[PDB]
RNA sequence: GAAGACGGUCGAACUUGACUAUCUAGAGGAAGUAAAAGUCGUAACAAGGUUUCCGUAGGUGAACCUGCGGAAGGAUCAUUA
């Protein structure tokens, strides 16, 4: 509904391996692998898929854990990409809902 | 009557070896437990769709199946001269 951007302690990541036990692996836009955690509103109200644009929170004393906040589906994700936040090597690969 | 010496006894300890109680690393690999969403299939609970279970043996990705002998914790307390 609204375009909210990243802040201090938050960034964007791409889901690489979709696991169980309410956690997943996401590749952050800084160049490090992290074990993210599914938020309490993100278990069943929304469904997180692979290769999607998500909001990932930083951890200030350990640097191998994270947690996920939001999810951008198609148009706000491509509008955020048009603004410029990521290295251009990463590929969207047309992330949206299929038919 | 001192130092010293042979022999005997008690005897700490040393060197060559074995046994030995506990702790700390260890490639390799099989296990158990706690995690809201991974994959395959549906074994069990209603006759769960092949009734379940026990002992033994073989089989197969996985739950699992089959042969032999028992149990009712069975869906039968009973089927007529």
Curated annotation (Swiss-Prot):
Location(s), subcellular: Cytoplasm
GO biological-process terms attached to the record: ribosome assembly; translational initiation
Domain S1-like, chain residue ranges per copy: 1-73
GO cellular component terms, semicolon-separated: cytoplasm; cytosol; eukaryotic 43S preinitiation complex; eukaryotic 48S preinitiation complex; multi-eIF complex; synapse
Keywords associated with the record: Cytoplasm, Host-virus interaction, Initiation factor, Protein biosynthesis, RNA-binding, tRNA-binding
Main location class: cytoplasm
GO molecular function, one term: translation factor activity, RNA binding
Family from the record: Belongs to the eIF-1A family.
Subunit composition and interactions: Component of the 43S pre-initiation complex (43S PIC), which is composed of the 40S ribosomal subunit, EIF1, eIF1A (EIF1AX), eIF3 complex, EIF5 and eIF2-GTP-initiator tRNA complex (eIF2 ternary complex). Interacts with EIF5; this interaction contributes to the maintenance of EIF1 within the open 43S PIC. Interacts through its C-terminal domain (CTD) with the CTD of EIF5B; from the location of the start codon by the 43S complex until the formation of the 80S complex. (Microbial infection) Interacts with human respiratory syncytial virus (HRSV) nucleoprotein; this interaction recruits EIF1AX to the viral replication complex to facilitate viral genomic RNA synthesis and virus production.
Function: Component of the 43S pre-initiation complex (43S PIC), which binds to the mRNA cap-proximal region, scans mRNA 5'-untranslated region, and locates the initiation codon. This protein enhances formation of the cap-proximal complex. Together with EIF1, facilitates scanning, start codon recognition, promotion of the assembly of 48S complex at the initiation codon (43S PIC becomes 48S PIC after the start codon is reached), and dissociation of aberrant complexes.
Protein name, as recorded: Eukaryotic translation initiation factor 1A, X-chromosomal
Shown part of the complete sequence: 24 to 122 of 144
């Amino acid at each position: 509904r609204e375009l909210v951007f990243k802040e201090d302690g938050q960034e964007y990541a791409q889901v690489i391996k979709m696991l169980g036990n309410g956690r997943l692996e996401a590749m952050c836009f800084d160049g490090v692998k992290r074990l993210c955690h599914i938020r309490g509103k993100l278990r069943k109200k929304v469904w997180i898929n692979t290769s999607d644009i998500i909001l990932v929170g930083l951890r200030d004393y350990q640097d191998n854990k994270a947690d996920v906040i939001l999810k951008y589906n198609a148009d706000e994700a491509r509008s955020l990409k048009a603004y410029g936040e990521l290295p251009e090597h990463a590929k969207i690969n047309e992330t949206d809902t299929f038919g």
